[PDB]
Design a protein around this ligand. Structure first.
Ligand code: GDP
Length: 325
């Protein structure tokens, strides 16, 4: 077979999620989200929140192999005049793509409770909801009308709920606290390196995936399909598991800036170009975000982890078919 054929076979048999499993898992999330809105509205009346909503690859049809996880965004309500956010490149940590949230002026905020040293801690905010998750063993049988049973995920996933549905199906929904100041959207998703775990993370995923969708919609291209193959490959081994969806998505987006033709028959050529690009970014130890160039997406990896990834992908341009096995 030509590489083209092996790629389509790989996507079909490995990357692609069965349309049945996919939609059913999706509905489970929708069902639980709707329930969690109502119940938590009553269980946490003091907490300034917006409506919770779903987010992630499962919601965008970019999830691969199996459908088992999705994010539940928890938007905190902040008084814009009592808080300011500071871009990481302007702090002592010097981490682009990550933010401090500083308490301002006077007034009272419910969220004053999560402030330490005059800053809103993403970890302290997380601990508030780890309590809420752990406290779910006190809840009534929510969603029991549609035969769902909500249980705290097994440790250490202190922010995850586990939804079991028909039959021996499990959907893992993790709570993700989010903060909007001005037009800056931040999520409490810790920096990989622990010395940065108290910085808020700038939300880049909605813009990345929207760009991906718009580009493929315009010409029925195979950018998304190619991405899904990569995500599936990177889920195959521990080594390649240190690569993220965001990283691979931005590899694709960068290549899309150089290549306009993403016809289905160009898939194999793009897949090779994608690997070449990935190798070059690893070589340089820098993968700039396509939508926010100031942010290096490889800055959560140690230089050794980067070198080891490069070593893992060294012969991929000459033996690409090996990745699919
Ligand atoms: N839903 C969501 N996830 C984010 C965001 N920022 C970072 N992430 C993280 O990125 C991951 C989800 O991205 P996703 O596209 O689903 O990757 P996938 O799990 O490989 O399919 C999770 O680990 C999230 O914690 C964000 O703004 N929204």
């Amino acid at each position: 077979m030509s590489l083209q054929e092996k790629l389509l076979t790989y996507y079909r048999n490995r990357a692609a999620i069965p349309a049945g499993e996919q939609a059913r898992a999706k509905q489970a999330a929708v069902d639980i989200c709707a329930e969690l809105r109502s119940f938590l509205r009553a269980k946490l009346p003091d907490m300034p929140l917006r409506d919770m909503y779903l987010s992630g690859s499962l919601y965008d049809d970019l999830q691969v192999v199996t459908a088992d996880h999705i994010q539940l965004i928890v938007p905190l309500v902040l008084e814009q005049n009592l808080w300011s956010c500071i871009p990481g490149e302007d702090t002592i940590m010097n981490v682009p793509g990550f933010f401090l949230v500083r308490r301002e002026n006077r007034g009272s905020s419910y969220w004053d409770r999560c402030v330490v040293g005059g800053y809103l801690s993403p970890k302290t905010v997380a601990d508030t909801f780890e309590k809420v998750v752990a406290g779910s063993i006190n809840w009534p049988a929510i969603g029991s009308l549609l035969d769902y049973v909500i249980r705290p995920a097994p440790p250490p996933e202190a922010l995850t709920l586990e939804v079991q549905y028909e039959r021996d199906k499990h959907l893992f929904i993790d709570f993700l606290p989010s903060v909007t100041l001005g037009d800056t959207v931040l999520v409490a998703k810790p920096h990989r390196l622990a010395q940065y775990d108290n910085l808020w993370r700038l939300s880049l995923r909605p813009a990345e995936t929207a760009r991906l969708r718009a580009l493929d919609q315009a010409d029925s291209g195979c950018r998304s399909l190619c991405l899904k193959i990569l995500k599936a490959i990177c889920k195959s081994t521990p080594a390649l598991g240190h690569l993220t969806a965001s990283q691979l998505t931005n590899v694709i987006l960068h290549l899309a800036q150089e290549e306009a033709d993403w016809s289905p028959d160009m898939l194999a050529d793009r897949f090779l170009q994608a690997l070449r690009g990935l190798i070059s970014y690893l070589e340089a130890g820098v993968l700039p975000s396509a939508l926010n160039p100031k942010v290096n997406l490889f800055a959560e990896l140690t230089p050794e982890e980067i070198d080891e990834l490069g070593y893992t992908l060294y012969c991929s341009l000459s033996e690409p078919e090996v990745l699919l096995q």
